[PDB]
């Protein structure tokens, strides 16, 4: 809502400078987007009138002028193409400061004296336009300081406002705070009721009296569109941002701007039988003032005629209906719509306008007539005409009415953290023009009025006062809690926990849009159907990932691209998975890694990382809780990783996740040259671990056995640890593989498992004739399981 | 991790919620009706009628309404999403949300706590300003300035809002308002961590440049 | 065809912190979670402030050179983190919440009992505090601390700084875990603080029995050998 | 009954590295937390702290228990081969705990953060190396930890 600052004083005065109404304003919940000056800097200029031109004798474009400041004449050169006599115009006299530091001086002309200068607005900073002089209204005051006449110690303050103060979309609004803010004299502009010259009017039928309770029509006869609005009103519009377009239009802006009540001129001679404000038929067809064909829902109101619809009412009008040229009568609308009725109605068509927006955050009810006596006055001072009398057709029924609201000083008090006097508590809110009756000690009966549309609670009163009050005046206290010794369980590793060991562990942390390419998401994800948003942002943001890894696997090669060699990142996230229909949302933890093992150091050897790196980052991490053992990697497959590199994890049968190399075929489609390192874990099933159970410490020593073990190049090292476990006994304290031989020195199908087995007893030293024993037995079971020998 | 240290010390719990939700959790609990703008495809994620991307933190703050009676003290981090993006605004960041519903609870109460979590959050004891705004959840409610002791380029800065929680928000929710009041409030966490590390762009959060990462070792 | 097994990561892995640091950070969570201070002070203390500052009378047997470690006649190895909770009275008025874990020091050891050992003190000053307020405080510390709903017993016992004061069990019948009491009048009083506008209450805990109750720790000794096949068992 | 408490949000400057996520970097790292007794052998006080007196007990527990240590050094080595001598190749062990310095007169009684490393650089397994621990990999410990608060540039090896 942007206004004239002059204009909002010469309702309610705060007395206090620019500066301090603008802060102020912020202060109080009208939050300032801009305050700026209405025009440039300049002195010396006052009204002139041209009495008489003649043709410059030695220049064709010139012209020699006779110019009056109402006190003296002047002979002005002048080079305009609008030059004339009768013309009122700023005149710059010999010693005028213009903008940009020009000053008036003495001048000859090509042979010819000039005692000044005429000027354009664009030469005094008023507008853009330099076409020619700056044309004044042929009754302007001659000689008076055009500073003063254009109102040009001015600005023009923008708020940007809250839904909530829909009756701030006018001056009247906008007027009536600064009188309370500021406790000040509110002088609303008096609207003598204009007297009817004759008796015609046209019936008005309230078809729909819930959606408009009140409806106010009056015929304006033989008006002379040709006539143009007036300076005055053209300058209170512009700095409200409306842009004058025709006299009638302008009236209803201006009275909608300056009151804050929407009003719509017909064309008398296209309404055929009086009004009949309706709800649409489905499918009824209406060609608005801008060309629009909409096609009407049983759900809108219309204005409407005895033939056909008129206007979307409260929103705006149509092309048929409406002025034209040939208008020579009116037929002028003020109207009250009900709020939950308009809500959304615009915005469903596509549209947007004045009309609808300050109907839709709610109109003073009680406004119409007002509205009405003041646009008919201003109508017949631009465009003349003769007024009938208003016809108003009103259903008390459907008037809106809140109920009083009970306040009570305590409530006050307790929500404030400080109390507020009887006295100060009325003040406020009757400044806000709310009626407030005593009702016992500490509580009153508080009234509503007709304009606010946010008011129907108790608190909604605290609110006003605390606003009024000061936000900022109001004490700091910190709340009371009665609060309980209370913590999580010991045995957990919470992502937190796990974050800080990947940095320790280095990696580096990223976060991805959860929303990926279709055809990225198919890559990683081949027969699945994505959860895929209705309205994307693009077509490439559409995809609900399934998969930490798309994404990271993205932001890994955005790197490489950016002359990184070694990227290790990670991400934690939901993970999407179904459609809303059974629809999973799982926190994961993913990871993903490339170039090499380690950083470029003297200390550091040059080899590149592999499956065995990622491997101990997620052992590091699944043994963070200490419930390693839990967990189990088994050769698994996944269609985004190389099927001989990679590992299902689970934890009791349940899929924990996947540990593998990106398949090569994957890599070639991304353009990525790098072999990369995934995991994904869900993070449900690495939290839980295991609380430490004491296990007693042996004062004996242990006793170490190695074997080395030749069995088939395929058969995995973790079964064949798994059985030695089971045939090792009751004293295995540790079982090593130090060492994996797959060379010449034996058969190319397998491969030499050197292990190192650990045995303490308890209570006493272990002799080698049960340690042999215990050896021969974990053999003979790698013999009978695996075919197995010693090397 | 901060914004939270800053409220688990003091008793608040860390809530957590889907970030798949519907219209009920999202807008409905929170006093936003059918019409309301804000639930507008222009603004909103939809994957259908009923279900979107949630715009904010908020449902947790519902979701947990639901399940327990007050004493509740909550903060809500996590993603959340907006349709309306460009430069200035990503389809997809990062907000807290808190939640504190009690029997004896003020806008003192708010005041304080807003006050002394941006002081401990910016490491310096700086002005904090209340400015009256709306939100359809909260009433009264604030906009929260403070001052540019922490540059616009290493005299007030909107960083946060808040409010006293709204009658409807906590009927709707079986908290009877006569016996319960409640404060909430919200901020972005790009925001906040662009005013502490300088970042001037905001789109560097989600391109995942080493050269950007590396700075926050 | 450059397929591999699932042998062992590559490298270093995790090692893993001690069965007390594990059990005092714990202590200290339950009570930093709801606005205690974590208070620290010096292990080689004086008379002052180790005895005298709270109601320890200096012919008190506590003082003796049988259970107290001295370097001379008024400077001493810490028998207690309570003077951390005095250093804390001194320097600031209340409100205060705080908590004291720390190394302390008995001359008096043997098998059951170290010449070192760790514990958890807590102070709580503020307006009106009760002996219900210390109730629910402990009741509520424990549950948290044992991850159960247990049964908590209070038994009223005796020490100098507190008044009245219990020895709190709880089951598995019963098992002594911690003291408490409400902070004696002479104590606040000898740190300017007024017995008649503040109330306060303090609670007492040895981290290694809380530890071994824990994780089925047997033997005390085993805390201080350092050991890796004790210490590894907490990774 | 719980007591009633007006608590005010409240933390730490965010730029620091405190003991307790020191400790959990060093376990990371490969670190096993020990905790030694702060009075140690007079004459292990002398091996590490030559020509300084030690603060001296009055009425120590033992003969071996009558120095109060200036450093965490002599007890970590002492733990250190404890386990050596029980069966033990590689022991990665630190402490944090209170140094104490000079004479009651003006005695300082700091923290500290000490560490002792020895045996193979990694754990035995079939994807590792069999060299041992030197300088250089006990110098990337204090790195990781000189660094844990952005401030390693501040820091100087000479
Ligand atoms: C049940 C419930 C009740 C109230 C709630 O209020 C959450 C709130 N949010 C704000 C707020 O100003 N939010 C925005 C600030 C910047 S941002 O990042 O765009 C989020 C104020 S009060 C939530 C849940
Ligand atoms: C100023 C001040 C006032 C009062 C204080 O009371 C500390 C307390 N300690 C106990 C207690 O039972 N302690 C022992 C339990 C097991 S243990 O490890 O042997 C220590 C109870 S109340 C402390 C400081």
């Not at chain 1, 646009?375 to 057709?393: C, K, S, W, Y």
């Not at chain 3, 009223?156 to 019963?174: H, K, L, N, R």
Request: glycine share 8%; proline share 6%; hydrophobic share 40%.
């Amino acid at each position: 809502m942007k206004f004239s600052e002059k204009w909002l004083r010469s309702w309610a005065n705060p007395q206090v400078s620019h500066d301090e109404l603008v802060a102020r304003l912020s202060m109080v919940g009208l939050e300032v987007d801009a305050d700026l000056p209405v025009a440039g800097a300049f002195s010396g200029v006052v009204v002139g009138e041209v009495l008489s031109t003649e043709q410059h004798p030695d220049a064709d474009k010139l012209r020699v002028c006779q110019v009056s400041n109402g006190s003296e004449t002047f002979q002005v050169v002048c080079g305009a193409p609008n030059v004339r006599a009768g013309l009122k115009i700023p005149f710059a006299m010999i010693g005028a400061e213009l903008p940009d530091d020009f000053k008036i001086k003495k001048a000859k002309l090509r042979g010819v004296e000039s005692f000044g200068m005429l000027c354009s607005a664009k030469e005094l900073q008023i507008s853009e336009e330099n076409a020619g002089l700056l044309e004044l209204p042929a009754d302007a005051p001659v000689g008076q300081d055009v500073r003063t006449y254009l109102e040009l110690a001015d600005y023009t303050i923008e708020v940007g406002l809250t839904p909530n103060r829909g009756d701030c979309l006018s001056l009247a609004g906008l007027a009536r705070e600064v009188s309370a803010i500021y406790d000040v004299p509110l002088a609303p502009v008096a609207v003598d009721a204009v007297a009817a010259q004759h008796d015609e009017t046209r019936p008005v039928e309230l078809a729909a009296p819930a959606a408009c309770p009140r409806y106010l029509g009056r015929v304006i006869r033989n008006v002379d569109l040709s006539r143009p609005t007036p300076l005055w009103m053209v300058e209170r519009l512009r700095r409200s941002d409306i842009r004058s377009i025709d006299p009638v239009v302008d009236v209803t802006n201006y009275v909608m701007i300056e009151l804050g009540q929407p009003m719509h001129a017909f064309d008398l001679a296209e309404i055929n039988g009086g009004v009949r404000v309706r709800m649409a038929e489905d499918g009824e067809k209406l060609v608005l003032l801008d060309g629009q064909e909409i096609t009407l829902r049983a759900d809108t109101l219309v204005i409407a005629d005895h033939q056909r619809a008129l206007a979307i009412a409260g929103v705006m009008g149509g092309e048929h209906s409406g002025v034209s040229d040939s208008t020579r009568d009116l037929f002028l609308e003020a109207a009250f719509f009900d709020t939950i009725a308009l809500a959304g109605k615009a915005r469903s068509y596509g549209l947007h306008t004045d009309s609808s927006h300050r109907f839709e955050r709610g109109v003073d009810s009680q406004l119409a007539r007002k509205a009405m006596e003041r646009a008919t006055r201003l109508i017949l001072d631009i465009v003349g005409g003769e007024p009938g009398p208003i016809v108003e057709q009103v259903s008390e029924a459907h008037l809106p009415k809140v109920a009083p609201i009970t306040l009570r000083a305590e409530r006050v008090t307790q929500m404030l953290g400080m109390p507020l006097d009887a006295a100060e508590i009325v003040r406020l809110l009757q400044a806000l023009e709310l009626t407030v009756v005593a009702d016992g000690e500490g509580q009153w009966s508080v009234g509503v009025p007709s304009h606010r549309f946010d008011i129907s609670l108790e608190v909604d009163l605290i609110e006003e006062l605390a606003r009024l009050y000061g936000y900022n005046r109001l004490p700091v206290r910190y709340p009371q809690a009665r609060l309980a010794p209370n913590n999580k369980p010991e045995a957990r590793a919470a992502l937190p926990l796990l974050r800080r060991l990947l940095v320790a562990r280095g990696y580096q942390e990223a976060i991805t849009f959860s929303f990926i390419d279709p055809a990225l998401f198919e890559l990683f994800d081949p027969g699945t159907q994505p959860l895929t948003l209705a309205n994307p942002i693009s077509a490439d943001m559409a995809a609900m990932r399934s998969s930490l890894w798309p994404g990271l696997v993205k932001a890994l090669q955005h790197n490489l691209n950016r002359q990184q060699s070694r990227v290790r990142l990670f991400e934690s996230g939901l993970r999407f998975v179904g459609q809303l229909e059974g629809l999973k949302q799982e926190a994961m933890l993913a990871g993903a890694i490339c170039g090499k093992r380690l950083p470029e150091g003297w200390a550091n050897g040059r080899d590149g990382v592999d499956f065995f790196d990622a491997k101990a980052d997620v052992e590091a991490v699944l043994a963070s809780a200490g419930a390693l053992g839990d967990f189990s990697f088994v050769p698994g497959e996944h269609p985004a990783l190389h099927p001989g590199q990679t590992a299902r994890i689970e934890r009791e049968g349940r899929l924990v996740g996947y540990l593998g190399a990106l398949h090569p075929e994957l890599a070639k489609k991304l353009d990525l040259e790098q072999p990369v390192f995934l995991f994904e874990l869900l993070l449900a099933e690495v939290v839980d671990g295991h609380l430490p159970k004491f296990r007693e410490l042996s004062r004996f020593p242990e006793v170490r056995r190695d074997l080395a073990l030749l069995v088939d190049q395929d058969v995995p090292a973790q079964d064949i640890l798994t059985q030695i476990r089971a045939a090792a006994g009751e004293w295995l304290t540790d079982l090593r593989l130090f060492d994996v031989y797959h060379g010449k020195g034996i058969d190319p199908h397998r491969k030499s498992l050197a292990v190192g087995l650990t045995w303490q007893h308890p209570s006493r030293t272990l002799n080698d004739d049960e340690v042999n024993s215990t050896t021969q037995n974990i053999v003979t079971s790698l013999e009978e399981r695996f075919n197995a020998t010693l090397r | 991790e901060r914004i939270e240290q800053c409220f688990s010390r003091i008793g608040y719990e860390v809530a957590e919620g889907p970030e798949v939700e519907d219209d009920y959790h999202n807008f409905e609990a929170l006093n936003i009706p059918g019409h309301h703008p804000a639930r507008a495809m222009h603004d909103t994620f939809y994957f259908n009628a009923n279900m979107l991307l949630r715009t904010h933190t908020s449902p947790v703050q519902v979701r947990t309404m639901e399940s327990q009676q007050p004493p509740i003290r909550i903060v809500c981090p996590g993603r959340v999403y907006r349709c309306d993006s460009d430069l200035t605004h990503s389809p997809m960041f990062h907000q807290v949300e808190g939640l504190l519903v009690d029997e004896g609870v003020s806008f003192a109460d708010l005041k304080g706590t807003i006050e002394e979590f941006l002081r401990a959050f910016f490491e310096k004891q700086l002005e904090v300003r209340f400015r009256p705004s709306f939100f359809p959840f909260t009433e009264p409610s604030a906009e929260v300035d403070i001052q540019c002791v922490i540059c616009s380029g290493n005299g007030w800065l909107e960083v946060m809002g808040c409010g006293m929680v709204h009658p409807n928000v906590l009927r709707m929710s079986n908290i009877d308002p006569e016996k319960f009041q409640g404060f909430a409030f919200g901020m972005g966490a790009e925001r906040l961590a662009m005013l502490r590390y300088g970042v001037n762009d905001l789109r560097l959060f989600f391109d995942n440049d080493l050269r950007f990462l590396g700075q926050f070792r | 065809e450059r397929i591999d097994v699932t042998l062992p990561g590559r490298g270093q892995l995790s090692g893993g912190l001690h069965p007390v640091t594990r059990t005092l950070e714990r202590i200290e969570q339950c009570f930093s979670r709801i606005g205690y201070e974590v208070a620290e002070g010096p292990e080689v203390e004086d008379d002052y402030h180790n005895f005298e500052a709270l109601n320890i009378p200096g012919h008190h047997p506590a003082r003796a050179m049988h259970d107290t470690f001295y370097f001379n006649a008024n400077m001493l190895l810490r028998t207690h983190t309570s003077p951390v909770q005095v250093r804390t009275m001194e320097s600031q008025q209340p409100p205060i919440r705080i908590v004291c874990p720390g190394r302390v020091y008995r001359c008096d050891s043997d098998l059951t009992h170290s010449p070192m050992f760790h514990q958890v003190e807590g102070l709580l000053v503020d307006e009106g505090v009760s002996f219900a307020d210390l109730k629910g405080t402990i009741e509520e510390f424990l549950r948290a601390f044992f991850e159960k709903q247990l049964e908590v017993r209070f038994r009223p016992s005796f020490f100098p700084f507190t008044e009245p004061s219990a020895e709190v069990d709880i089951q598995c019948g019963w098992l002594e875990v911690m003291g408490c009491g409400m902070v004696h009048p002479n104590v606040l009083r000898m740190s300017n603080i007024d017995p008649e506008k503040f109330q306060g209450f303090a609670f007492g805990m040895g981290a290694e029995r809380l530890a071994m109750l824990r994780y089925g720790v047997n033997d005390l000794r085993l805390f201080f050998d350092n050991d890796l096949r004790f210490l590894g068992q907490f990774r």
